[PDB]
């Protein structure tokens, strides 16, 4: 079971420094932005990372939600990334949840983080180019895959 402990405003970047944002259609995407542009787009770029205590410690347990949104919490249900219409809950009774990820520092890589699904072991949040877009996906982990590494500014 998980219990919510604390929350921090966060900006998330992939390894090419593209900023995670939520677009008009509620999709999580990455794009290039100058800090001035990131500030100007604060409502679409500011996330809340909420840390939870876990009765079965396996890594820093977090939800990721949109700050300037009524209720948009990141989910990997069915191995598909979406925002569900809910807030980070105070308690979660199960040992796995489609909205809980384990945030882990990457050994040997300065300040980088990975986010592993609590529901689907060995699956991580990743940035994947599709057509001309860079999208947030869930994918299975080759060692040192840079597409599953992020910087978190808080």
UniProtKB/Swiss-Prot annotation:
It comes from the Eukaryota. Changing residue 84 to A: Reduces binding of the preformed binary complex of IL18 and IL18R1 to IL18RAP resulting in impaired IFNG production. Keywords: Cytokine, Cytoplasm, Inflammatory response, Secreted. Changing residue 149 to A: Reduces binding of the preformed binary complex of IL18 and IL18R1 to IL18RAP. The keyword Cytoplasm applies. The keyword Secreted applies. One of its GO terms (biological process) is positive regulation of natural killer cell proliferation. Changing residue 132 to A: Reduces binding to IL18R1 and the ability to induce IFNG production. One of its GO terms (molecular function) is cytokine activity. Induction: In macrophages, release is increased by endocannabinoid anandamide/AEA. Changing residue 146 to A: Reduces binding of the preformed binary complex of IL18 and IL18R1 to IL18RAP. Changing residue 109 to A: Abolishes binding of the preformed binary complex of IL18 and IL18R1 to IL18RAP. Belongs to the IL-1 family. Pro-inflammatory cytokine primarily involved in epithelial barrier repair, polarized T-helper 1 (Th1) cell and natural killer (NK) cell immune responses. Upon binding to IL18R1 and IL18RAP, forms a signaling ternary complex which activates NF-kappa-B, triggering synthesis of inflammatory mediators. Synergizes with IL12/interleukin-12 to induce IFNG synthesis from T-helper 1 (Th1) cells and natural killer (NK) cells. This is Interleukin-18. It comes from Homo sapiens (Human). The gene is IL18. The chain holds residues 37 to 191 of 193 of the full protein.
């Amino acid at each position: 079971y998980f219990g919510k402990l604390e929350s921090k405003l966060s900006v998330i970047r992939n390894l090419n420094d593209q900023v995670l944002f939520i677009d008009q259609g509620n999709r999580p995407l990455f794009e290039d932005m100058t800090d001035s542009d990131c500030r100007d787009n604060a409502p679409r770029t500011i996330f809340i990372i909420s840390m939870y205590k876990d009765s079965q410690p396996r890594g820093m347990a977090v939800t990721i939600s949109v700050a300037c949104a009524a209720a948009s919490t990141l989910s990997c249900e069915n191995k598909i990334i979406s925002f569900k219409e809910m807030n980070p809950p105070d308690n979660i009774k199960d040992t796995k949840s489609d909205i809980i990820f384990f945030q882990r520092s990457v050994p040997g890589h300065d300040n980088k983080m990975q986010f592993e699904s609590s529901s689907y072991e060995g699956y991580f949040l990743a940035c994947e180019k599709e057509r001309d877009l860079f999208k947030l996906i869930l994918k299975k982990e080759e060692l040192g895959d840079r597409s599953i590494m992020f910087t978190v500014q808080n």
